[PDB]
Amino acid sequence: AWQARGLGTARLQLVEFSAFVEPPDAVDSYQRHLFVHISQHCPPLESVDVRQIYDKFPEKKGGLRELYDRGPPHAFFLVKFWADLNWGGFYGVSSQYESLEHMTLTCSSKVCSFGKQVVEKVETERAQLEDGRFVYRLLRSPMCEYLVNFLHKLRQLPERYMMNSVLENFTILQVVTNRDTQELLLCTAYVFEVSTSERGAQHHIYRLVR
Ligand SMILES: Cc1nccnc1-c1nn2c(=O)cc(-c3ccc(C4CCCCC4)cc3)[nH]c2c1C(=O)N1CC(CF)C1
Numbered sequence: 144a145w146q147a148r149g150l151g152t153a154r155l156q157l158v159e160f161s162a163f164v165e166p167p168d169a170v171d172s173y174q175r176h177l178f179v180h181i182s183q184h185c186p187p188l189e190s191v192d193v194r195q196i197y198d199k200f201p202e203k204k205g206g207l208r209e210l211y212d213r214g215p216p217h218a219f220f221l222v223k224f225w226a227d228l229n230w231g232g233f234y235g236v237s238s239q240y241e242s243l244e245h246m247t248l249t250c251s252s253k254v255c256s257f258g259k260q261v262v263e264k265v266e267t268e269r270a271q272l273e274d275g276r277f278v279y280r281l282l283r284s285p286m287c288e289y290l291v292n293f294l295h296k297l298r299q300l301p302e303r304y305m306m307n308s309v310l311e312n313f314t315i316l317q318v319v320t321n322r323d324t325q326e327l328l329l330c331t332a333y334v335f336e337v338s339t340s341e342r343g344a345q346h347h348i349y350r351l352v353r
Pocket residue numbers: 160162178179226227236238250251252264265266281284285286287290294315317333335
């Protein structure tokens with residue numbers, strides 16, 4: 144009834160997220176490989192109990208339990224990615240959000256290994272007023288070197304099951320806050336598996352409940 148149908152709330156919706164590489168010869172004929180992708184351009188999610196994923200993220204001072212405790216609970220999501228690691232340039236990420244409200248956002252991504260934080264990236268994004276709605280675009284950001292390096296390490300593992308073993312202990316926690324009020328707008332826990340070499344990237348979005 145008031146349960147989300149996609150990744151977002153009534154205040155802030157994800158429009159698109161992509162992690163990609165454009166090969167050097169994209170200048171001659173354009174092409175790009177999507178490692179992971181979410182697109183909600185053209186439209187109730189199933190749920191997962193947040194307690195079962197606590198141990199995949201840090202456990203104090205910005206941990207998932209402390210964040211979920213502050214709320215609001217309807218802003219929390221889990222995204223499972225099947226990553227397309229069959230490729231082979233410029234490694235990039237792009238994200239876009241929309242809202243009916245004019246806000247300044249702080250977007251934080253915390254990369255975790257074995258449930259502990261290893262790198263964090265934070266950027267603020269001001270709104271652009273477009274067709275009645277406000278849009279928040281961060282396009283073609285250079286991929287952080289930690290994950291460019293990680294992608295290259297993963298690609299050279301000899302077995303899909305070893306890749307999945309490694310990614311079992313790798314997660315990303317994304318928190319989008321109103322920069323002016325410090326209110327949380329969206330929190331998404333990302334977990335990862337490798338897609339079969341013949342299948343491209345896919346995702347499954349869940350509501351997080353407690
Ligand atoms: C530009 C930015 N500004 C503010 C806050 N966050 C970001 C950001 N930077 N960034 C990076 O530099 C690399 C990845 C990235 C790269 C690779 C992969 C996987 C690794 C495992 C194998 C398949 C590819 C996932 C994410 N993702 C991201 C995100 C950003 O939005 N993110 C939303 C979160 C989604 F995970 C990250």
